[PDB]
Amino acid sequence: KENEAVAPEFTNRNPRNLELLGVARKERGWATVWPNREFWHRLRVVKTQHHVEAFVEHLNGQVVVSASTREWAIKKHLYSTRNVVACESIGRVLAQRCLEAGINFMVYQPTPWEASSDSIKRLQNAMTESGVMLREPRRIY
Amino acid sequence: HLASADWIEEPVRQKIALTHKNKINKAGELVLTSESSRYQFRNLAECLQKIRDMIAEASDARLQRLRIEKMNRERLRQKR
Amino acid sequence: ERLEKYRSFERYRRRAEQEARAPHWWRTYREHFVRTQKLLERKHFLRELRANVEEERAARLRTASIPLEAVRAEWERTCGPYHKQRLAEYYGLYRDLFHGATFVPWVPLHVAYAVGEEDLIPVYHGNEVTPTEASRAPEVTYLWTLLFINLDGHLLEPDAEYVHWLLTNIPSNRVAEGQETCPYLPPFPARGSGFHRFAFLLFKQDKPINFSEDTRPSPCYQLAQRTFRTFDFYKRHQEAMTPAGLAFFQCRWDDSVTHTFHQLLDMREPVFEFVRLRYLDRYRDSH
Q1: Rounded distance, CA A80 to CA C198, Å?
Q2: B41, exposed or middle or buried, with CB in 10 Å at 0-12, 13-18, 19+?
Q3: Is the CB of residue C280 less than 8 Å away from at least one CB of chain B?
Q4: Could you tell me which residues come within 8 angstroms of residue C242 by beta carbon, excluding any fewer than 6 positions away?
Q5: Which of C24, C29, C254, C268 could be bridged to C131 by S-S, CB 3.0 to 4.6 A?
Q6: What start-end ranges are recorded for coiled-coil regions in this protein (chain C)?
Q7: What is the DSSP letter of A133?
Q8: How far is the alpha carbon of C113 from chain B, nearest alpha carbon, in Å?
Q9: Residues of chain A found within 8 Å of residue C196, distances taken between Cβ atoms
């Protein structure tokens, strides 16, 4: 059968083919700086004076999932942009946006004071129940 | 052929396969090559010594994560 | 006291990261490796929400909750299309499909794979759907032209790609009336190639145009005739085609893929994996 012919090597072009497979390279540099760079995606949580925002950023520096309370849809149903519940809601909203984007794994590096914050802990509780993993898969060598 | 080879006892066969699965060819044969000398017999002798060491020495998290990501996918799979 | 001190480490880290992004004379990692009336009405509601004592009581009681579904619908209407472009560009669809041309989507295209009749599997942007879950054609909810691609599903040529099914002259939303130029084929991603991205494209049709060239025999099981290029095809129809909708998912290898390659494609399953004394005294160390 002529159809049986198959090329010796594939030509996969998806940027996340290796990343999703786990074979993609993770930043192993910055040995003189803290923290580790061995994460494909990271959760950036920024609390402004009047608003709370959480972002998920890939190593390339492009945010793929961005959750902000300034966005009209969330705030109209959200009593006060700055609140512990707002952190929970933005976490669920960020999860839902993470659900929207197709990204299931991310690395979160909270600070000592940020980690102690109950709002961030509840936000993490919102993330874990939504399935968004705070720990990414290890790279494959 | 590691598995078919009956001279190796079955418990050793499994242990060798697990430790050196990377050295098993698609046909299932266990391939080892060193060529650490210019003399073929020494190269063969080095191969022979490794087999004796392999015989003597021989004598999951991945699944869980797949469930977690699959569970995440199902929850992520919500646009109806 | 004269020197400014950030009161948190992350502020310096974020500022340093922002500083690192911009080029500098000193060496950095990147260089080496790289309407109004509506708002006023909206604000009036916000003041009412703040005035509501019940909302304030919940906040101090830390028991308040928000409906995700209501937020999701509103988000799509307001700024959803802009986020839609980001995902498509991040995955490289624009560079692979239109050779770098970038279009902001305007039609909120949504696709889901019908699981029998009880439920239909969503197709998000960057979603994960197994080929077993793609044995059937998906439902699309959003003249028009609707096109299906496997961007990296081609097995022989990098630039080339295959069509799953292509509909032309789609009237309004209904898709049953579209001409079945390409019959539906289940995904056939090669094993060991990881995740293949499939992009669903919606193009605005200014006038009805018969794509006799793009018509394909129904059923067609030949890869030699499925191969095509989006760029040249889009260029041939760029006058009457302006893309406005997107939807794409990632699929791994699966047992159904073996069935697809053999039963109807009738060819071997493709398998790949990335691959990471005197005379002799002179030769040996001793001499």
Answers
A1: 40
A2: exposed
A3: yes
A4: C103, C203, C204
A5: C254
A6: 36-59
A7: B
A8: 10
A9: 12, 14, 17
